Design a binder for these strands. Structure first.
Lengths: 150, 190, 83, 129, 84
RNA sequence: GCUGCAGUUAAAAAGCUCGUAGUUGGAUCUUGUGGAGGGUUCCCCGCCCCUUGCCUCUCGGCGCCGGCCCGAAGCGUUUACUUUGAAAAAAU
């Protein structure tokens, strides 16, 4: 079930058994890497590169054409960001609710939902700090949070 | 030079120098001169199959094999035409490293890659034999005596390229790994 | 049941259900024994020869005896492995 | 969440045997499940079985013969020594004449009668009769 | 389900009816197709559950629009699946 | 009540949700032929790929007409588990 809601829905992707590239695909490994390097200059995060490539080109799974996952391809050229994808989007969501509560102090539902976002930031940062993606002295703060996404 | 097969001390054998001569002389005609370049064949053998006939196995080094498969559809058809009624397969020169935990010397200074495990090598050898066709799925049957059989499903397109060689695939995989395999076609596939 | 001299010591050996391989008890009054006629292959007529099955009372009351008798009659030659 | 896979496999067989079904599907598969099934099959309590590859841990289909009264798991994998094995078979078995405890030992997964011939102790996995 | 149906050989009409994650082995319902338009005729490839508003190499303003399920084509000349 | 109890109505589930310590945590990384004891395939030797996994010294006996071999040692990533040795008053 979901970690902070009573729901237990089932929707997700389902990959095929066959890992091979199909015979009709015209692209090749190093031309797929150059298209990844061009899309990264526009500020697109790794999750957005994979949908642009799936929708408008033949590549269903980049990992099956090129033997690497696309965050590794960007890191080996220094093109990847420092703060990771999901922790960036969680911190960007918490500053929007805090801008609401400064003028709407009667909104007790918004007060409750902010506890459930910031406790999910603390759980994900504690994971990245043990795997050396973040400094041991890294800390989310309710005053500093606006400066993390500028 | 000729006699390209095997490490020092093993090289002079008549059969294996014969197959490697028959490979390296074929670059001299104008068609395969466009696409062969004296590329290494590491070994070859001639082996018995269940009908009382014979077949040959050719061993190719890993960084060369991605180029051999791109021309194998003509190159094996020329070799199966030239030899005396034989069947041919190309396979990779894979190495297995031993289990580090209490079955080898081990230390922190180098780690065994999972690409060098026995399981990752034996299930890659199965893909080389069938090459003109693609594996659609596997099943394993355990018998009342405690033995195993593997059932392999092959794609329904390209039947004409492999149906006459399933009887050599079982005998070759038996002699490369010690295991019984059957090759079959699906009822339907999604 | 046998002893170390190899002789048998049960009162009787009870029957088992043909569909299910479980023992039919002395008070299972919902259970049955079915009996079915064989016919000669030249003229389709009764020769006095027959086949038999026994069915558990628990399988009858859940409604599974009709399909069990059919599977048994296809496993023997009677329904001839086509339908 | 799913804390233990062997307990699912045996509970799934045990519910199918009591309904009188002729086959059952076990998912996820494991190296421990395939070795436990093999010990029941070698003693004659189940039929033969087949494994399906799906690239995600796999599945098993098993054939049932109607002979099995029960199979089960002891959840903490307690250690046992040869002097204490008598107390466990006095607790868990229906008679001295039939039924088996299953142990894991450094000589392999095995029947509690084989552990006495091999002079070895181990950890408890489960039982059948 | 009767007492005795075998589980190793589902018919293709038993398998096509059930959810993608609950089949005997998993497989997607989505597909790739090749698409073509009037005025400029360079053929292009599209995914049937697209989220992007696709623009063709022929520079027309919309090839297809996104939707809560399958994307809908702008009356293009092909909806033909690729075979594999 | 560990083995081994109970909590709809007999005694008994915090009004509801978050959360640090504590307890618990998914799949995966080397096998069959030959010989002895015993069977009609598996437990001890030697093998498809590694069988103590390596290695080459030097103080130190062996085998033979200097040189090449076979028992120590560096040691096998660290522990629980299990089986075996040693060492623990008498009386009860």
């Amino acid at each position: 079930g979901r970690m902070h809601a009573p729901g237990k829905g089932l929707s997700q992707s389902a990959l095929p058994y066959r890992r091979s590239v199909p015979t009709w695909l015209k692209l090749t490994s190093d031309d797929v890497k150059e298209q990844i390097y061009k899309l990264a200059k526009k500020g697109l995060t790794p999750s957005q590169i994979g949908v642009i490539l799936r929708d408008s080109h033949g590549v269903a799974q980049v990992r099956f054409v090129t033997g690497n996952k696309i965050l590794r391809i960007l890191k080996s050229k220094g093109l990847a960001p420092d703060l990771p994808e999901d922790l960036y989007h969680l911190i960007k969501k918490a500053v929007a609710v805090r801008k609401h509560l400064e003028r709407n102090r009667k909104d007790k539902d918004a007060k409750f939902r902010l506890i459930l976002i910031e406790s999910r930031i603390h759980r994900l940062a504690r994971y990245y700090k043990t795997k050396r993606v973040l400094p041991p002295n890294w800390k989310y703060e309710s005053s500093t949070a606006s400066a993390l996404v500028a | 030079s000729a006699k390209i097969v095997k490490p020092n001390g093993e090289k002079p054998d008549e059969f294996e120098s014969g197959i490697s001569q028959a490979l390296l002389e074929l670059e001299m005609n104008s068609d395969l001169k466009a696409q062969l370049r004296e590329l290494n064949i590491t070994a070859a053998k001639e082996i018995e199959v269940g009908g009382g006939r014979k077949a040959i196995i050719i061993f190719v080094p890993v960084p060369q094999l991605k180029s051999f498969q791109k021309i194998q559809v003509r190159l094996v058809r020329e070799l199966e035409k030239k030899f005396s009624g034989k069947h041919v397969v190309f396979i990779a020169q894979r190495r297995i490293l031993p289990k580090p935990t209490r079955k080898s010397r081990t230390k922190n200074k180098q780690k065994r890659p999972r690409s060098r495990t026995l399981t990752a090598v034996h299930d890659a050898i199965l893909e080389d034999l069938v090459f003109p066709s693609e594996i659609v799925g596997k099943r394993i049957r355990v018998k009342l005596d405690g033995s195993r059989l593997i059932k392999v499903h092959l794609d329904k397109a390209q039947q004409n390229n492999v149906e006459h060689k399933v009887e050599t695939f079982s005998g070759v995989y038996k002699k490369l790994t010690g295991k019984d395999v059957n090759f079959e076609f699906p009822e339907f596939q999604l | 049941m046998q002893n170390d001299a190899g002789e048998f010591v049960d009162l009787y050996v009870p029957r088992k259900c043909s569909a299910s391989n479980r023992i039919i008890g002395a008070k299972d009054h919902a259970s049955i024994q079915m009996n079915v006629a064989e016919v000669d292959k030249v003229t389709g007529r009764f020769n006095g020869q027959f086949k038999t099955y026994a069915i558990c009372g628990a399988i009858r009351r859940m409604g599974e005896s009709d399909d069990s008798i059919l599977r048994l009659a296809k496993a023997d030659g009677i329904v001839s492995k086509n339908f | 969440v799913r804390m233990n896979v062997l307990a699912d496999a045996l509970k799934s067989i045990n519910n199918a045997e009591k309904r009188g079904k002729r086959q059952v599907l076990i998912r996820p598969c494991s190296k421990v499940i395939v070795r436990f099934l093999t010990v029941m099959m070698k003693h004659g309590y189940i039929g033969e079985f087949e494994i399906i590859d799906d690239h995600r841990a796999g599945k098993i289909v098993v054939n049932l013969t109607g002979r099995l009264n029960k199979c089960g798991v002891i959840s903490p994998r307690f250690d046992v020594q040869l002097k204490d094995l008598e107390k466990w078979q006095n607790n868990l078995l229906p008679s001295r004449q039939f039924g088996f405890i299953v142990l894991t030992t450094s000589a392999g997964i095995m029947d509690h009668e084989e552990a006495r011939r091999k002079h070895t102790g181990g950890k408890i996995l489960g039982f059948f009769f | 389900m009767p007492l005795a149906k075998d589980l190793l050989h589902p018919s293709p009409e038993e398998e096509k009816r059930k959810h993608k994650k609950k089949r005997l082995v998993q497989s997607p319902n989505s597909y790739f197709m090749d698409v073509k338009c009037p005025g400029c005729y360079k053929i292009t490839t599209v995914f049937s559950h697209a989220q992007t508003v696709v623009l063709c190499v022929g520079c027309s303003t919309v090839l297809c629009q996104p939707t809560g399920g399958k994307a809908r084509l702008t009356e293009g000349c092909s909806f033909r699946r690729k075979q594999h």
